[PDB]
Design a protein around this nucleic acid. Structure first.
Length: 576
DNA sequence: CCAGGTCTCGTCCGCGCCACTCGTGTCCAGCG
DNA sequence: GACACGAGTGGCTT
DNA sequence: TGCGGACGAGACCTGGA
């Protein structure tokens, strides 16, 4: 079987094997799945290939895939009987015929009925024939279909079922069959989706969010704004619908996969575009409304407070609301790492600024958390490779451009037993899960608290050999197994990881792992990019490399201060 | 004492799967 | 009529 | 969300006065 068919079959079997997931699908949808199974291998390959393509008609001349078959003409018939593909006979909607027609063939069609400018843009000509059809339409359609040829569209019905299956799988695509996943007991005690309609709703919400992200990428913002507006209108409805209340009681990691969560991320994208369209007052209204709920996306409350403060300060030029927003944001426990530092820095800059005296300062009430200053080194001399070269010139001999993946890899290696341990409900729902589902959530440290603290303390008091024994044992058992935390390409060899942990030492590594385990989402970003060590000296310098243009991020400063606190010498290498 | 150039911090913005084949918009030199 | 560039979408991606 | 590029606004001095 080819790669795409293997991946699709893996997804299909994964969704089949979970009984709760198939509780969602109706009888005819399971019939469609079985119909897919009772097809030729060539037919399955063809349908997967068309599934990767967009839901538009494809000219039969363009469709040919030599590997699936020398000739696709029968396979098309086979899929046609089952209801998977609709051949030319169903092409009764004229707009898609025009889109199917090639532009030179558009010119030919305009010649056939030259009631309109012969030449021009494809969109313009298509609008022209569409107007012409409205004002003879049967003959126009007949000639259009005749000149187009034979085309096959992936039927909406079956494609919807396979799309929901893919959504369920990726919820928890080229190398899917080849990559093997780690060993862990599959245990789901709650249902991410309660009813089939709920998955339909989740599919609709994710489709809307994907449309808004496509508008993000294309740079089109007005359509993005109206899409976000209708999304907000939709989420204004269905709020009273009992489905949401059941979804609230869900754990945070499982609540991530809910209609409300996707609509809240859509609202966040609306905040981003509103700032992009410079409708800053509306962005402030949305951000204040976003923080009015504690239920959905508590993880992103930091960006909401930071953006609210920045909007009220430098883009609405109001100080009194800014003081309140900074104080409230620092008061919310959910803010971590960079955003807390950003709000603090805003508060301190306002404190030692003119025109802030007018009101009671309220920063006397505000806590004073100060990032420890880190040593800054500037070398003159691909900037990160240059920094590696400069440190190689120093006493240090080796180093790895971790970019935060090195600490994630070490943490995953040294805590793999706890990361994938059993006895935790719903944190592994499918046989295909690269990472435990409760990771990137505060529930990770709480649920695993005894063993997590035990292993973290052990690493804290671990001799270098014990860390090396643990890293060696875990790597041998799990090399290759998929894991979001562990990047196997990140370390050249297991000996490299052994040398790294031993050089880093048990305490500072234990602290880094503790921070990554308490809240991985906020602590993962901002780690120093470059870690350098000398094998003989066993001395390490963790270096965050920032070019002349870019300055230290708030997360980077927080992590550098924390790493210096743990006993690591950290400097920021500027290469000018 | 006043500058006008410079700095530096704060902020916005584009992308956030990649080169790759192929249908397209336009114009551009001739063409009548 | 060609047209020759770029751009863009779409497809494929072990 | 994390980058790496941009912009500009207030400081700010010092050359010149």
């Amino acid at each position: 079987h080819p790669y795409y068919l293997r991946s699709f079959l893996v997804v299909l079997k994964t969704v089949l094997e979970n009984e709760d997931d198939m509780l969602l699908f109706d009888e005819q949808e399971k019939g469609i799945v079985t119909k897919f199974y009772q097809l030729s291998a060539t037919g399955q390959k063809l349908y997967v290939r068309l599934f990767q393509r967009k839901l538009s008609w494809i000219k039969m001349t363009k469709l040919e895939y030599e590997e699936i078959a020398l000739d696709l003409t029968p396979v098309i018939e086979e899929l046609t009987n089952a209801g998977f593909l609709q051949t030319e006979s169903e092409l009764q909607e004229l707009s898609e015929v025009l889109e199917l027609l090639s532009a030179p063939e558009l010119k030919s069609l305009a010649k056939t009925f030259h009631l309109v400018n012969p030449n021009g843009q494809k969109q313009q000509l298509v609008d022209a024939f569409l107007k012409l059809a409205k004002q003879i339409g049967a003959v126009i359609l007949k000639r259009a279909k005749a000149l187009a040829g034979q085309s096959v569209r992936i039927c909406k019905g079956p494609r919807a079922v396979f799309s929901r299956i893919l959504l369920l799988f990726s919820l928890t695509l080229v190398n899917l069959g080849r990559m093997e996943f780690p060993s862990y007991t599959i245990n789901r005690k709650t249902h991410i989706f309660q009813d089939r309609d709920d998955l339909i709703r989740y599919a609709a919400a994710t489709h809307m969010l994907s449309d808004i992200s496509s508008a993000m990428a294309n740079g089109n913002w007005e359509e993005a704004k109206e899409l976000a507006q209708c999304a907000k209108r939709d989420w204004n409805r269905l709020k009273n619908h009992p489905s949401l209340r059941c979804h609230e009681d869900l754990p945070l990691f499982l609540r991530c996969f809910t209609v409300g969560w996707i609509y809240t991320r859509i609202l966040s994208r609306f905040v981003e575009i509103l700032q992009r369209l410079h409708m800053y007052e509306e962005a402030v209204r949305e951000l204040e409304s976003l923080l009015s709920q504690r239920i959905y996306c508590p993880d992103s409350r930091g960006r909401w407070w930071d953006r609210l403060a920045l909007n009220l300060h430098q883009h609405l030029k109001r100080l009194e609301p800014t003081i309140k927003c900074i104080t409230e944001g620092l008061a919310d426990p959910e803010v971590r790492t960079g955003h807390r530092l950003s709000l603090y820095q805003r508060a301190v800059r306002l404190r030692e600024s003119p025109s802030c005296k007018k009101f009671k300062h309220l920063f006397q009430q505000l806590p004073e958390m100060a990032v420890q200053d880190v040593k800054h080194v500037t070398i003159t001399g691909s900037v990160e490779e240059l920094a590696l070269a400069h440190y190689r010139r120093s006493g240090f001999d080796q180093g790895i451009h971790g970019e935060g993946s090195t600490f994630s890899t070490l943490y995953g290696l040294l805590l793999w037993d706890i990361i994938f341990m059993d006895g935790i409900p719903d944190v592994f729902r499918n046989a295909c899960q690269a990472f435990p589902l409760d990771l990137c959530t505060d529930s990770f440290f709480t649920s695993r608290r005894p063993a997590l603290e035990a292993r973290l303390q052990l690493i804290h008091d671990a001799p270098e050999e014990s860390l090396r024994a643990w890293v060696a044992a875990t790597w041998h058992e799990q090399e290759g197994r998929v894991a979001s935390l562990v990047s196997w390409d990140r370390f050249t060899s297991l000996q490299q990881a052994q040398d790294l942990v031993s050089c880093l030492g048990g305490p500072v590594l234990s602290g880094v792992c503790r921070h990554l385990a308490a809240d991985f989402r906020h602590c993962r970003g901002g780690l120093p990019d470059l870690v350098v060590w000398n094998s003989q000296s066993r001395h390490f310098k963790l270096v965050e490399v920032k070019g002349p243009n870019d300055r230290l991020s708030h997360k980077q400063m927080i992590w550098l201060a924390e790493l210096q606190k743990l006993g690591a010498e950290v400097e920021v290498c500027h290469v000018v």
